[PDB]
Ligand binder design. Structure first.
Ligand SMILES: O=C(O)c1ccncc1
Ligand SMILES: [Cl-]
Ligand SMILES: [Cl-]
Ligand SMILES: [Cl-]
Ligand SMILES: [Cl-]
Ligand SMILES: [Mn+2]
Length: 340
């Protein structure tokens, strides 16, 4: 039967089932006030699916100049055409290659650039903004979005949305690597998976995806979404409570020292955005510091709600297109205040 919601992460994570249910807020707000992330499924079914394909982005915008990042080693690939990224999104043998002759796992950096998303893509913008879940929190003018309502004593988010476009990580070695390293944001965000590209060429990569999710510490209810409903999984997230950030900094300072980094006792390994917590570091965080995370698999059409100040990392399993809107909820407004 259709239900309003379910739980993932053994009851620690709310999953809302209907993105346009006008009563979602009553369930949402109790979980959110406690600083938990929230998942809303089914957003893809509300969108104009033809607007969110990699072929359309290449055809319409292929001639713009951009930089990419090699996810395996962090190297910048400078001043290439945005078609060089998109045409290899799903066809492996079209990807830029590294010195070793392997097809590279790439991230498109800052595209569309800064705040130009609405000017460059006004139909996409309309399609996203009209279908975001919890609209009183997430729309630019929502009754519970304080973004446009706060003085300069608060850090206000840039006008979005932001696009996050990147290939999936492939091999056993890539299991220890991030699409996006551990970092925190001073605003709230809703991040929506609008497209998951399962490749072809080396299209027999189904089994390393299960070992990544398994070793990623994903729950049994989450593994059932693959094997029973055949939903497409895009990315593996780890998110931590805002209250645990300083314990995460102490660990990463200790591990820096152990690896002979030379860093002042004050420097911020979260703000550096230089760490991905692999199974070894996540186990050590739990055991030595008492800190437990939420391991979240974002499928096509899942919306991930990210509490302000909450450290998070993402590991794309397959090539992903996602779009995120920043907002400022009353529940978390402390995290963007500039005093005390
Ligand atoms: O690459 C992502 O998916 C991402 C980047 C930054 N914050 C959240 C998610
Ligand atoms: Cl558009
Ligand atoms: Cl709402
Ligand atoms: Cl990063
Ligand atoms: Cl908080
Ligand atoms: Mn982020």
């Amino acid at each position: 039967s259709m239900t309003s919601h379910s739980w993932l992460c053994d009851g620690r994570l709310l999953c809302l089932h209907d993105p346009s249910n006008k009563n979602n807020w009553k369930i949402f707000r109790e979980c959110w006030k406690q600083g938990q992330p929230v998942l809303v499924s089914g957003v893809h079914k509300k969108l104009k699916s033809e607007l969110w394909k990699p072929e359309a982005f290449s055809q319409e915008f292929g001639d713009q100049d951009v930089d990419l990042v090699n996810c395996r080693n962090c190297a910048i690939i400078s001043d290439v055409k945005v078609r060089d990224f998109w045409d290899g999104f799903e066809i492996i043998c079209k990807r830029l290659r590294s010195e070793d002759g392997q097809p590279m796992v790439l991230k498109l950096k800052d595209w569309p650039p800064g705040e130009d998303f609405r000017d460059m893509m006004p139909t996409r913008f309309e399609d996203l903004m009209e279908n975001l879940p919890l609209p009183e929190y997430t729309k630019r003018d929502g009754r519970l979005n304080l973004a446009s309502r706060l003085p300069s004593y608060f850090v206000r988010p840039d006008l979005g949305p932001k696009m996050y476009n990147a290939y999936g990580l492939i091999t056993a070695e890539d299991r220890r690597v991030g699409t996006t390293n551990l970092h925190l944001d001073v605003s709230d965000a809703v991040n929506v998976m609008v497209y998951v590209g399962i490749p072809i060429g080396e299209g027999a990569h189904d089994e390393e995806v299960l070992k990544t999710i398994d070793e990623g510490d994903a729950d049994e209810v989450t593994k059932e979404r693959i094997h029973d409903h055949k939903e497409k999984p895009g990315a593996l997230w780890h998110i931590y409570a805002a209250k645990d950030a300083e314990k995460i900094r102490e660990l990463l300072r200790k591990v820096g020292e152990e690896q002979g980094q030379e860093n002042p006792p004050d420097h911020d390994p979260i703000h550096d955005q230089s760490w991905y917590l692999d199974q070894t570091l996540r186990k050590r965080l739990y055991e030595e510091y008492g800190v437990q995370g939420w391991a979240i698999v974002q499928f096509l059409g899942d919306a991930v709600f990210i509490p302000a100040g909450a450290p998070h990392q993402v590991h794309n399993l397959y090539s992903c297109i996602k779009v995120a809107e920043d907002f400022v909820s009353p529940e978390h407004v402390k995290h963007c205040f500039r005093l005390t």
